[PDB]
Symmetry: C2
């Protein structure tokens, strides 16, 4: 940076603290990643100056010739990446991507079937304090109490009983592969649309390490900033038959002017994802998650679903008689960033929880491999089995420092 240090000492100092923090800590928040310097440069571009309501070649402002190229690059790369017939790269976020799909196919008060929020579902999948649960009538399907795998017979019964206009598949905290074929089969039985929110697993889908929801879902939503390793924002994929309606839902429906600089960064991120090395990266994410899962089990930890098929895992802390909140706090003390997370059939409230959610996307980006996973698990073991020992926590603190250089 050059001009920010001179113009705003306060803001520059705070950003510099954040930059250094991102390097010093072991980042295990499952939804986080590190973007390339190219993605950031695109976001820091003059494209923020341009009003571009509408779509490429069909704008409501003049002078959009070059931002049109940028948006088309984003749309076409996404389509190549996911095999979709249409992309909308304007959603400001995952929330807005989901909001737009709901706005497209649902009327106020329509019934929607989504994943139980305490079993893995996201806030935008029917939380009573979120627009989704306030605007629409959300019912929920659950996971099996033993296996923690989605109970597809429950999905089917809930759909047949409540007759939703829309079924939502996908999760903020589900460690196993989702069967989109079964979701579509159930959707077809009850005459419901199928929406897949692939936000968490999008990078893995692109690399072919998770089944692609595109051929099965009427609508696929995602964030660009999780496993996809792009800028903060949203995206909608769908077939040509919904293309016009989806575009209208985003604008003039729920948004105004798109963030053209962020869309530029989306294009960059998609360009990177199309490369061979991103496929290798994404495999390492999954391999690292499996390794970390195995190594945590070796430490004596119980994992939700008994392991993982993807980038993320959940530790059931009940055997150690710890809350997710306690675990989160103490790991923060040694430089390991996790978040407390509800486990399926959690006896605790979502503000306390019996678990922690861990992901490998961020650490894999910085170059962590299987050996690092073994060590991360060993540190977590040392910390959580010795919460009252300041010497154990200091040892953990030093071992975290050794890993991050």
């Amino acid at each position: 940076m050059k001009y920010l240090p001179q113009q705003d000492p306060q803001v520059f100092a705070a950003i510099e603290q954040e930059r250094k923090r991102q390097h010093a800590k072991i980042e295990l928040i499952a939804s986080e990643n590190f973007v390339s310097r190219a993605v950031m440069e695109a976001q820091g571009s003059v494209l923020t100056n341009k009003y571009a309501e509408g779509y490429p070649g069909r704008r409501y402002y003049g002078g959009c010739e070059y931002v049109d190229i940028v948006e088309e690059l984003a749309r076409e790369r996404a389509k190549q990446l996911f095999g979709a017939e249409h992309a909308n790269v304007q959603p400001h976020s995952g929330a807005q991507a989901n909001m737009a799909v709901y706005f497209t196919v649902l009327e106020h008060g329509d019934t929607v079937l989504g994943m139980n929020l305490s079993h893995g579902g996201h806030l935008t999948h029917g939380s009573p304090v979120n627009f989704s649960g306030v605007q629409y009538n959300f019912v929920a399907y659950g996971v099996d109490p033993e296996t923690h795998v989605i109970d597809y017979d429950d999905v089917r019964e809930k759909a047949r009983l409540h007759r939703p206009k829309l079924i939502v598949a996908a999760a903020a905290a589900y460690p196993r592969i989702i069967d989109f074929a079964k979701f579509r089969e159930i959707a077809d039985e009850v005459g419901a649309y199928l929406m897949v929110d692939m936000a968490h697993i999008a990078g893995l889908v692109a690399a072919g390490l998770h089944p692609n929801p595109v051929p099965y879902a009427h609508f696929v939503t995602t964030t660009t900033h999780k496993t996809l390793r792009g800028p903060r924002g949203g995206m909608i994929l769908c077939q040509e038959q919904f293309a016009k309606q989806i575009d209208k839902a985003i604008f003039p429906g729920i948004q105004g002017g798109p963030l053209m600089h962020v869309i530029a960064a989306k294009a960059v991120a998609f360009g990177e994802a199309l490369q061979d090395d991103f496929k290798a990266y994404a495999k390492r994410v999954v391999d690292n998650a499996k390794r970390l899962a195995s190594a945590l089990q070796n430490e004596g930890f119980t994992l939700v679903s008994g392991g993982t098929d993807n980038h993320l895992l959940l530790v059931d802390l009940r055997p150690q008689q710890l809350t997710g909140k306690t675990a989160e706090k103490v790991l923060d003390e040694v430089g390991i960033t996790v978040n407390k997370n509800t486990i399926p059939y959690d006896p605790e409230s979502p503000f306390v929880t019996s678990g922690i959610r861990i992901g490998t996307a961020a650490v894999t980006t910085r170059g962590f491999g299987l050996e690092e996973m073994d060590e991360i698990a060993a540190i977590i073991g040392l910390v959580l089995k010795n919460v009252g020992s300041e010497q154990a926590l200091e040892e953990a603190r030093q071992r975290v420092a050794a890993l991050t250089d």
Copy 2:
């Protein structure tokens, strides 16, 4: 830029075209501006990597210590700038800022009173193809057919007849000062909340050149990217009594993770607005708008409301027997960027229009003064009075080139 040119030739080339376009053209889109290099650097920062759901000191992720400082700097500077008791700097856009306020005080189907969209009102103020008009029952007040000034007796009658739960004041294309005192007086008579959407005039409010809606409105919404000259995004101001409800409406209500890098840029933009030179800048914007208005009248053009009190003006093209669409297209040919815009009581559809909307914020930022305004008006005169003459258009093209260097 360094890494984007190597990583993505296609995206870099398109951005570079846009950068050069922004310099070459005379930018008169009323909602546009040019941000500082400091604002852009903040947006191009590593802060995009951080999930920060919730608010400073009350986050739902660990490691937010430094993004908390950034957000607080943004909130406190905004409060200093506008004299507000509370700020929410998380809205992704003006659309989302408005959406959150509607979500706070209204139920589905509630009556809202807003400015007639063909008289100056924005899409988010009750368009039937926008969430606002679909989710809520919007009624409209108008401007006087002669003066084009808001008819406050009409605002009062519409409020008394339809009994709205909320009154919205402010506009996307209104060239005169809005009387927020009268809006509040009417709001109090019918027991309605008052929302002011100051998006367009926010920079002028901050510099003291337009009356401040804050002391009069329960809620003030704005974009950060118009006269305020900040990054693309939204903001909500309100009194302490609505602070908690407004924060809840943004999250977990209508959004998810905030754009911390954009919030950093918002703080930078507010820092700049607090400086003496921004006040001088904003006065030049208004002075330039008055000068341009006067010079256009000198060319023989009729202006909506007979002039301007702010940054923007509207040309009624009916005397020249031109549509806004025709005027927009031909000015595009010579390098002058305007947008077609409905005039009050327009005989044409919003896709054709009888007017063009012009603003001075962008050209004032690049250093244009009164003499430049005289020349811009003279060029517009040459073009619109000689639409069929390619030699007149070539002369105009050269004169535009002379202005932009």
